[PDB]
RNA sequence: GCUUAACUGUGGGCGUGCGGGCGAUACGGGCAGACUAGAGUACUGCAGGGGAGACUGGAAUUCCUGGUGUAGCGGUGGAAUGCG
């Protein structure tokens, strides 16, 4: 295989789930673990417990590829931001730095309209 | 006065008007005007997302291109449509 000394916790933290993609500094997701990856789907995909489970599974894969030092790259808001953060902290990946990597269309494109249920 | 009354006669006021002559010049108005407070013009600056026209930007989205890289992603109160 290979070893990644420093990783990046690219957390696609959708309210649906926190896809914790660990990425080498090159910019390649060496592995990822989401709520479904642990086994959480539907509402359980969006439960806070799924967040630390996904983060911990990703960090276990990180150790499996010898990853210890990771800076945290959290995407948009979801379920279990700080939860996945201290999961990664408690799973062999120290926090390093936290960065809210969220897209900012500064009054740009048009989305769908809305939901009323 | 009609027996009274109803009713009729008599004369007034009334018929508010119009027309003609005569008057007034406060006001309207007409004429001749005049004045700048009104209005309109200049000078000098002040606010600018007032508009129009021509040029440019990248966020961002999606798609497309090359990767790494997974069996999940998104879906909802949950689902199942949808895809991998």
From Swiss-Prot:
Q: Which GO terms describe its biological process?
A: translation
Stretch list, region Disordered: 98-117
Gene Ontology, cellular component aspect? ribonucleoprotein complex; ribosome
**Would you say which domain of life the source belongs to?**
Bacteria
Q: Which UniProt keywords apply?
A: Ribonucleoprotein, Ribosomal protein, RNA-binding, rRNA-binding
> What is this protein for, i.e. what is its function?
Located on the platform of the 30S subunit, it bridges several disparate RNA helices of the 16S rRNA. Forms part of the Shine-Dalgarno cleft in the 70S ribosome.
What is said about its interaction partners and assembly? Part of the 30S ribosomal subunit. Interacts with proteins S7 and S18. Binds to IF-3.
Task: Give the UniProt family note.
Answer: Belongs to the universal ribosomal protein uS11 family.
Q: Under which name does UniProt file this protein?
A: Small ribosomal subunit protein uS11
Supply the source organism for this entry.
Mycolicibacterium smegmatis (strain ATCC 700084 / mc(2)155)
What stretch of the whole protein does this chain cover? Answer: 22 to 138 of 138
């Amino acid at each position: 295989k290979k070893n990644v000394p420093h990783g990046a916790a690219h957390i696609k933290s959708t309210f649906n789930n926190t896809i914790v993609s660990i990425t080498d500094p090159q910019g390649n997701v060496i592995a990822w673990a989401s709520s479904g990856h642990v086994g959480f789907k539907g509402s359980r995909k969006s439960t806070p417990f799924a967040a630390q489970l996904a983060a911990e599974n990703a960090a276990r894969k990180a150790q499996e590829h010898g990853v210890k030092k990771v800076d945290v790259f959290v995407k948009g808001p979801g379920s279990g931001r700080e939860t996945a953060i201290r999961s990664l902290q408690a799973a062999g990946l120290e926090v390093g730095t936290i960065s809210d990597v969220t897209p900012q269309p500064h009054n740009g494109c048009r989305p769908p309209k809305r939901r009323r249920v």
